[PDB]
Ligand binder design. Structure first.
Ligand SMILES: [Cs+]
Ligand SMILES: [K+]
Ligand SMILES: [K+]
Ligand SMILES: [K+]
Ligand SMILES: [K+]
Ligand SMILES: [K+]
Ligand SMILES: [K+]
Ligand SMILES: [K+]
Lengths: 92, 92, 92, 92
């Protein structure tokens, strides 16, 4: 499934970029920076906000450019990969 | 309505898993753990974040795997079960 | 536009119910209770969480039953009512 | 691509309006006011809430009127402008 892999690669790259940015500029531990990237792009959010003007501007751009991609990835992780499995049982 | 029941079962199982995980690893009361699972997977969020690295990693995986499912469930709870009722009045 | 009015009425009723519930059980001012209802059902969220077990259970049910409705309402407020206006200028 | 530009213009105007409102009434720095507008309309949210009744009422209206628009803009920024680029490599 190429599109799955493609959306996966772009998401991975997006999250790597976010992890690097927030670990460097906002000073988060790598794991916390990946968490922040993930909850931002899925719109889940969390209890902290960037506190540098650079972090705020980057987050604005990051959100606008990443939400669509991660939403597409979540969609296919659910429908091209998850739906079939569901049918694997509910029909004999 | 099979698909409704199926989405319902998978959602229940997802939420049970989350309740168990967050009550065990993050140490939340069962009710708070279910709340956290629910607001996470609907992307509503809340004022607390996991504070163990295990909780953060699990939440990343949980979000990615659960959002699609709960969104589908919410869709059908609204359209295969809620829309008809609406027509039950607005047309004689 | 009937469906607009219908989605509007159901949303109003949903928000009224939320305002009453959160002003009574969580003890919020009416305006804060309406804010909480609105940011919950649009998944925007805010910096506070219900602190009674009754408020948490109600919010779980409220979210599951209301998000679909408000999403439909937001969709039509944007497409059956907002899109035409946009065309009102960008084409002579 | 006209629709892209149109959605872009309406989004810019929406965000400008939010920046002005929150910098004036809630007293946020311009950059923080734009951040608040952006995380509100993308439903990402943040760790602060308006504290004037005027800010709460405006945010209710702002959300209802803006979410649809920004969602459409995010969609096209991802599909009319981002998808082609993706094909630019994954096919020779
Ligand atoms: Cs959120
Ligand atoms: K901050
Ligand atoms: K959200
Ligand atoms: K929050
Ligand atoms: K934390
Ligand atoms: K959302
Ligand atoms: K609380
Ligand atoms: K506040």
């Amino acid at each position: 499934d190429k599109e799955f892999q493609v959306l996966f690669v772009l998401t991975i790259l997006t999250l790597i970029s976010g992890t690097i940015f927030y670990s460097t500029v906002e000073g988060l531990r790598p794991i916390d920076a990946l968490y922040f990237s993930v909850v931002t792009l899925t719109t889940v959010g969390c209890d902290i906000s960037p506190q540098t003007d650079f972090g705020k501007i980057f987050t604005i751009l990051y959100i606008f450019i990443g939400i669509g991609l991660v939403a597409g990835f979540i969609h296919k992780l659910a429908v091209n990969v998850q739906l079939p499995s569901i049918l694997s049982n509910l029909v004999p």
